[PDB]
Design a protein around this ligand. Structure first.
Ligand code: MG
Ligand code: MG
Ligand code: MG
Ligand code: ZN
Lengths: 131, 286, 244, 294, 154, 110, 149, 166
């Protein structure tokens, strides 16, 4: 009736192995999705007026000045997009809304700090969990 | 310390009542309680029921086998004259046999369409351990019963009650005793349905057999009324049709339950045990 | 707001009453047996050998000069006293003394047992129900030994009679909640115990009452209890390590 | 021939008959002084009853923590079942999953899960098929999976369980866990053990081997409710001990032509050693691969 | 708003905060193991880790001598720091002190902790130990590792 | 500000007996593998830590009798020695502390 | 209360009067005092009235226990087992005579609120109302705006 | 004052019939005049109410409240009293049946305020009562499920009659 964590019962010899083992699996899954147009992509429709495309999930790094040819100092924010993937698609009929909803994740995190329901969702998708 | 006695005395009675509530005393026989005269209480028994009971027969009707055996054991310890008391086993059989044969006469005459299997159950119900004891406890039968254990067990109480009928049977005859069964046993099935006393299994199966005896084609079950079929609170009225003629309509929460109840409705109409039947005639015989 | 608790009680000694008092505590029974009796080893075998037992009981009384003299002292304070009726009279006292435990009739028990015997019998069964019965008697009782106290030890003379009994008994002791705890109410078992009686000869109202039981070192182990027992080892503080 | 639904009826009657017979042979009450030898509470002495008291009963005298954690009992240097009555006064020690060298504990748990896996096999298959258990291979703990060889009917010669078939075993395995049926151990003679398992061909051979090794010719019997099986070595006290339970796959042993022997593999872990979901799925992959004892 | 604040507010002020930590640090140098409230131990742990670094600079360093002179109220411990503690951790680069939690004191039920320098001559604390490799869970992962190593070499 | 009305016991029970006010049960309790007494998973065992302090206090009392005053901290290492022991090969040039007691089992000599 | 007291439905004992009428009163216990003005009305009731009252009701057993007491009482026991105890302390002969007759008429049931002034075991003879009683049936029993085949 | 809790250990039941089931042991123990608030003591008694004898000691050992150590001493001597005098076989086979606190006699002192004002402050004392019953603690009541709610709601719709009519 007491809670437990992933490395409570692991010995000194197993903890480095477990950390390295799951780390290698994350690298393989991220490197196995870098070919989307070969693994049976969905049809690519041409651009039409009144169409909305999906966005990204970026990480705010900081700020950096930027100068234009007009000589005006404009400050910009560095947004780093890392481990950004599409999770699932919901059609307009299933959305109960005017537009179709698309799920996006980012910033791959540890698999030991997520609930069972979330982990099994990514197990079939073959991607590490997103924050 | 306030002087006086009436207030202190009155408060003690209130405290004793609370004592009887927190720790109620176990029940005891009314005979052991004061202001009891067995000879007087049994004479009023006949007048209360308006019957010419015989005291010699009536006194032996409440004497049980267990009471006699326990009575002998008490004298053995003290070494103490012989007792010639008779048990009510002989009287109980006379009352029991007569009651079943008298109820059979009443039921088969009032309900000529009721099958013999059904007649047995109603006699087994009116003379049952539950119906007899409820009638027995409200006629000062338990108080006058001489038993070994208090309260009187229902099995012992049932046997003692029929002994009273047996005592009444010899003193008054069958004609006078037949009214006693009508006024105390027949009146126990008034607000009760046929299958509420005659518990059966698969009424639909029994309905088919009763229609075969009367050369009636197999009934066809069809839906007459329907409401909330897709909801959790449905209502189905399944109608039984013989040769495209409606014979019974029954409600129910589901189709099988409604069909089962519709079968019971048909059986009640066939046996003549409907709610619309005329009430039992308790008037004086002509 | 200056009111305080009435805490003023201090612990005093109950060992001795206030001194320099004319009144003194009057005692009816002695603390222990004046001369301890050790039954000979192998008496259990002699229990079966009734014929050898009868001869030994008569011989021991005659061969023990001291035991024969103490009988004379008893007959001085009570002329109407016989040694051939006491073993039968002891059974009546012994049976009646153990029947008061079931009904908790402590008023009559003090007339059957002494003030020394009462705490041992009743303290352990204060909140327990005891079902004891006397089924059958195997061997008649015999006057093993009679010894009297020294003359005018405290102004009174005490006389003790050692009696041997070998009878079957039934014991059924239930706990406070009615659960069976020790013994069996159905099957009796043989009991071999030596009963010592005592009486204050000086007191005119005195009488023979049960005093104690002799427990020989060669006695068989008693009947085991129903439940299990855990015996903890010595509790140890952290600074103290375990020593066997 | 006796139906499988009634086959276990006679086994329980024989099992209870001998279990009550051993109680009758023991006297009414005999006291045995059990001493505790351990780092915790040294010197404690238990006055227990012979053939009635169990190491679990001794654990209740100390504390409830002992009862929860004492997976196995170490009596006189030999493993002892928690619900096995003690026969003589002797020193006692309790073993847990989390110890310096829980070698016997892991083996006792590993064999226990093998018996639980066999129990659900006798029920999932239809009554028309003859499912005969063979034995419980003593696979090492480091192998990563516990197996229970099973022989099926000739009709199911090429039928292979699917993903959904295996999930049914896991759900039924958890049902046995939810019932919390205690492990009842009973050591009987070889001749008595043959009577219970006479209708089973493979069990008779297994009982024969055990009788030859032990000079006393005694055979240990363990049961979980109605299911009765023959196993070697002490087992865990209750089925609730194992938290995660899953069967990986089924492999057919060779040669197959003379006889078809299927190997039901699976992996399990107790409540005391619960593993994370991510780590657990890694163990599932290993258990799927066929493992062979040395 | 306290964002990025790494230093705690203790004592009667910033100056009193240094003196309270200085007394704890000085008592830690002399006894090599002290017990104190958890927050003060954790705050002082950073200074104890960096105190050895100044001790590795040598006693001839003027800057290192002043830090030892300031942080050590008792002047007899300064020779000990440059001749015992600093040589002891010559091979190590950090993590000279270990901090563990202990049962709260009965006086005020305050969260307590014990801090000691590694390698001391005092009896070892009952340090927390992970489950042995011979446990059931470790053996299953050990078996998986062996096959993975064998598969990789294939 | 003073209360306008007296709050009833029914209102008070809902506040005093609210689950937030009630004590929370702890799930981080386990038995110490060494002595068997209870301990928390993140806190050192009280019984085990107590016997270390009792021995540590005895050792520090011996050190005080050797220095014989304050401001006399040695510039060399320290070694704790018990009955039946001699200085080791690596324990050379250090300050030895002699203890008139057997070495504890949990105290591992290094 | 009505809310502060229990209640019961109108009923009788074993359907009294359905086939025959049975006097539910079973026993009367009078405790009069030889000396004491409190029993002056009760003593006159015993001397002339209880004798004729016993003539009218043979099924009721009457006990007259003469003992010293400050409050004379009458205890009535009924067949159903309920016991009603009443005090006749300092009451006239007529008031006692009316009170005793009232006890004879009662059935013994508790004198509490009765929910309904009527009680019938077969309230319906033509069929209890159900929502489909007054709704006509349609061809093939089709539902509204429902097409078949 | 009232001391009925102590007398509850002196009631002796009649011996049980062979067919009667095992009656669990009942142990009543208490400590009087504890320098603690009955309001604060209630949270400690409520915490261990329904827990096992060993589980309750685990909660009270690591609890920071002062009364936690006071209650633990009461349980330890009550656990010993159960085996020693009440014929309880296993000391760990106990659970807390009744655990409550009662007000004790409190002294009255004066707390001085400003402007020559004063306020009477009491030195609160409290009692602690504990009842031990042999046997495992009863399983906690499962939360009421949707099926039970659906069963109850339908049962309500079946017990309704036509009111204010025949
Ligand atoms: Mg502050
Ligand atoms: Mg002031
Ligand atoms: Mg002033
Ligand atoms: Zn410890």
């Amino acid at each position: 009736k007491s809670g437990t964590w992933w490395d409570e019962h692991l010995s000194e010899e197993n903890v480095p192995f477990i950390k390295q083992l799951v780390s290698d699996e994350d690298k393989a899954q991220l490197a196995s999705k870098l070919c989307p147009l070969k693994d049976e992509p969905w049809p690519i429709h041409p651009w039409e007026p009144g169409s909305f495309r999906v966005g990204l999930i970026a990480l705010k790094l900081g700020m950096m000045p930027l100068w234009t040819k007009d000589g005006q100092k404009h400050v910009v924010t560095l947004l780093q997009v890392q481990d950004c993937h599409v999770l699932k698609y919901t059609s307009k009929e299933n959305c109960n809304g005017k537009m179709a909803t698309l799920s996006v994740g980012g910033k791959t995190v540890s698999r030991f700090r997520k609930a069972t329901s979330i982990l099994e969702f990514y197990r079939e998708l073959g991607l590490p969990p997103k924050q | 310390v306030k002087k006086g006695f009436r207030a202190a005395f009155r408060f003690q009675k209130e405290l004793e009542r609370q004592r009887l509530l927190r720790c109620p005393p176990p029940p005891v026989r009314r005979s052991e309680k004061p202001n009891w005269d067995y000879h007087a209480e049994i004479q009023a028994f006949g007048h209360r029921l308006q019957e010419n009971f015989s005291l010699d027969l009536l006194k032996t009707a409440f004497v049980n086998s267990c009471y006699i055996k326990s009575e002998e054991a008490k004298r053995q310890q003290l070494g103490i004259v012989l007792l010639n008391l008779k048990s009510n086993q002989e009287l109980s059989e006379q009352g029991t046999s007569f009651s079943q044969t008298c109820l059979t006469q009443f039921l088969e005459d009032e309900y000529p369409d009721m099958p013999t299997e059904g007649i047995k159950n109603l006699v087994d119900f009116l003379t049952g351990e539950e119906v007899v004891c409820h009638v027995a406890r409200n006629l000062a039968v338990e108080q006058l019963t001489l038993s070994e254990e208090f309260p009187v067990p229902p099995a012992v109480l049932q046997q003692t009650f029929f002994a009273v009928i047996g005592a009444l049977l010899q003193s008054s005859g069958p004609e006078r005793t037949a009214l006693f069964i009508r006024d105390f046993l027949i009146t126990q099935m008034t607000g009760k349905e046929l299958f509420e006393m005659w518990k059966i299994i698969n009424p639909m199966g029994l309905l088919v057999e009763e229609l075969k005896k009367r050369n009636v084609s197999a009934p066809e079950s069809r839906l007459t009324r329907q409401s909330g079929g897709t909801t959790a609170l449905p209502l189905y009225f399944v109608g039984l049709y013989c040769d495209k003629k409606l014979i019974a309509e029954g409600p129910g929460e589901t189709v099988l339950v409604a069909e089962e109840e519709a079968a019971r409705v048909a059986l009640r109409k066939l046996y003549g045990f409907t709610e619309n039947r005329r009430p039992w005639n308790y008037s004086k015989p002509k | 707001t200056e009111k305080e608790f009435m805490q003023h009680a201090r612990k005093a000694g109950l060992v001795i009453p206030p001194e320099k008092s004319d009144r003194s505590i009057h005692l009816a029974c002695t603390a222990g047996i004046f001369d301890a009796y050790v039954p000979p080893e192998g008496d259990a075998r002699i229990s079966s050998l009734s014929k050898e037992g009868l001869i030994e009981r008569t011989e021991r009384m005659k061969k023990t000069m001291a035991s024969q003299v103490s009988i004379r002292r008893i007959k001085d304070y009570d002329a109407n006293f016989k040694i051939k009726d006491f073993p039968e009279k002891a059974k009546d006292i012994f049976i009646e003394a153990h029947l008061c435990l079931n009904n908790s009739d402590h008023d009559r028990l003090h007339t059957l047992v002494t003030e020394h015997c009462f705490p041992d019998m009743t303290w352990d069964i204060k909140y327990k129900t005891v079902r004891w019965s006397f089924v059958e008697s195997l061997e008649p009782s015999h006057v093993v030994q009679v010894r009297c106290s020294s003359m005018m030890n405290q102004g009174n003379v005490y006389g003790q009679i050692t009696v041997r009994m070998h009878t079957r008994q039934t014991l059924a002791i239930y706990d406070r909640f009615g659960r069976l705890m020790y013994g069996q109410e159905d099957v009796p078992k043989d009991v071999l115990e030596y009963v010592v009686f005592e009486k204050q000869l000086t007191n005119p109202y005195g009488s023979w009452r049960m005093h104690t039981k002799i427990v020989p070192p060669w006695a068989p182990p008693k009947q085991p209890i129903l439940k299990t027992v855990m015996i903890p080892g010595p509790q140890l503080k952290p600074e103290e390590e375990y020593e066997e | 021939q006796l139906s499988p639904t009634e086959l276990t009826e006679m086994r329980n009657d024989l099992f209870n008959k001998e279990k009550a017979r051993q109680l009758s042979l023991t006297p009414r009450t005999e006291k045995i002084e059990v001493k505790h030898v351990g780092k915790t509470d040294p010197g404690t002495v238990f006055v227990m009853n012979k053939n009635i008291s169990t190491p679990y009963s001794c654990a209740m005298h100390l504390s409830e923590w002992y009862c929860r954690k004492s997976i196995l009992a170490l009596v006189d240097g030999q493993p002892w079942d928690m619900y096995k009555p003690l026969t003589k006064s002797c020193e006692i020690k309790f073993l847990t999953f989390k110890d310096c060298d829980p070698g016997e504990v892991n083996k006792a748990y590993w064999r226990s899960c093998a018996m639980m896996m066999g129990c659900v096999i006798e029920r999932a298959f239809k009554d028309e098929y003859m499912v005969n258990l063979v034995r419980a291979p003593e696979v090492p703990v480091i192998s990563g999976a516990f197996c229970y060889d099973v022989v099926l009917d000739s009709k199911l010669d090429e039928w292979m369980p699917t993903k959904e078939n295996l999930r049914s075993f896991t759900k039924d395995a958890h049902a046995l866990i939810y019932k919390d049926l205690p492990f009842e151990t009973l050591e009987v003679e070889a001749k008595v053990a043959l009577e219970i398992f006479q209708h089973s061909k493979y069990k008779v051979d297994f009982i024969e081997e055990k009788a030859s090794q032990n000079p006393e010719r005694i055979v240990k019997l363990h049961r979980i409710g109605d299911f009765i099986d023959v196993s070697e070595g002490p087992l865990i006290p209750r089925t609730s001990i194992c938290f995660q339970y899953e069967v990986s796959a089924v492999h057919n042993l060779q040669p197959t032509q003379p006889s078809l022997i299927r190997r039901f593999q699976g992996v399990s872990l107790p409540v005391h050693l619960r593993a994370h979901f991510t780590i657990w799925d890694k163990l599932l992959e290993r258990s799927r691969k066929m493992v062979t004892e040395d | 708003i306290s964002h990025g604040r790494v230093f705690r507010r203790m004592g009667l002020g910033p100056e009193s905060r240094i003196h309270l930590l200085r007394n704890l640090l000085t008592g830690l140098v002399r006894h090599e193991r002290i017990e104190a409230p958890w927050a003060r131990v954790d705050e002082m742990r950073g200074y104890a880790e960096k105190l050895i670094d100044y001790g590795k600079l040598g006693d001839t360093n003027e800057r290192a001598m002043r830090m030892a002179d300031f942080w050590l109220t008792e002047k007899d411990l300064i020779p000990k720091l440059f001749q015992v503690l600093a040589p002891r951790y010559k091979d190590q680069t950090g993590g000279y002190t270990r901090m563990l939690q202990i049962p709260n004191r009965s006086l005020d039920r305050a969260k307590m902790a014990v801090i000691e320098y590694k390698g001391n001559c005092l009896p070892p604390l009952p340090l927390p130990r992970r489950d042995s490799h011979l446990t059931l869970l470790n053996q299953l992962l050990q078996g998986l590792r062996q096959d993975l190593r064998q598969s990789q070499e294939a | 500000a003073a209360p306008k009305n007296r709050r009833t016991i029914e209102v008070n029970r809902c506040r005093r007996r609210n689950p937030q006010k009630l004590i929370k049960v702890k799930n981080n309790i386990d038995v110490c593998p060494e002595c068997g007494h209870l301990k928390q998973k993140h806190v050192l065992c009280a019984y085990c830590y107590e016997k270390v302090c009792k021995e540590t206090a005895e050792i520090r009392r011996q050190i005080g009798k050797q220095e014989g005053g304050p401001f006399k901290a040695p510039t060399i290492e320290t070694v704790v020695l018990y009955t039946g022991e001699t200085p080791s090969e690596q324990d050379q040039g250090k300050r030895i502390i002699e203890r008139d007691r057997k070495r504890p089992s949990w105290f591992t000599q290094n | 209360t009505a809310r502060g007291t229990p209640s019961r439905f109108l009923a009788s004992v074993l359907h009294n009067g359905l086939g025959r009428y049975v006097q539910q009163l079973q026993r009367l216990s009078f405790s009069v005092s030889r000396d004491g003005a409190s029993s002056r009305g009760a003593r006159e009731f015993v001397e002339r009235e209880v004798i004729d009252f016993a003539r009218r009701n043979p099924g009721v057993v009457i006990y007259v226990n003469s003992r010293p007491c400050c409050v004379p009482r009458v205890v009535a026991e009924y067949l159903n087992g309920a016991v009603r105890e009443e005090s006749i302390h300092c009451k006239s002969v007529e008031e006692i005579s009316t009170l005793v007759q009232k006890l004879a008429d009662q059935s013994g049931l508790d004198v509490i609120r009765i929910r309904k002034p009527f009680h019938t075991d077969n309230p319906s003879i033509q069929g209890q109302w159900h929502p489909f009683t007054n709704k006509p049936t349609t061809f093939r029993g089709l539902r509204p705006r429902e097409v078949q085949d | 004052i009232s001391r009925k809790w102590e007398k509850k250990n002196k009631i002796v039941y009649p011996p049980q019939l062979p067919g009667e089931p095992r009656r669990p042991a009942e142990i009543y123990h208490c400590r009087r005049q504890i320098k603690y608030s009955k309001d604060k003591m209630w949270y400690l008694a409520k915490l261990i109410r329904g827990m096992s004898i060993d589980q309750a000691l685990a909660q009270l050992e690591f609890n920071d409240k002062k009364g936690a150590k006071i209650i633990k001493e009461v349980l330890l001597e009550a656990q010993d009293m159960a085996v020693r005098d009440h014929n309880v076989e296993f000391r760990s086979n106990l659970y807390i049946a009744e655990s409550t606190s009662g007000r004790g006699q409190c002294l009255k002192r004066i707390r001085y305020h400003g402007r020559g004002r004063f306020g009477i402050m009491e030195k609160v004392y409290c009692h602690y009562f504990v009842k031990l019953v042999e046997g495992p603690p009863p399983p906690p009541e499962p939360p009421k499920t949707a099926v039970a709610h659906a069963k109850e709601y339908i049962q309500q719709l079946r017990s309704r009659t036509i009111v204010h009519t025949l």
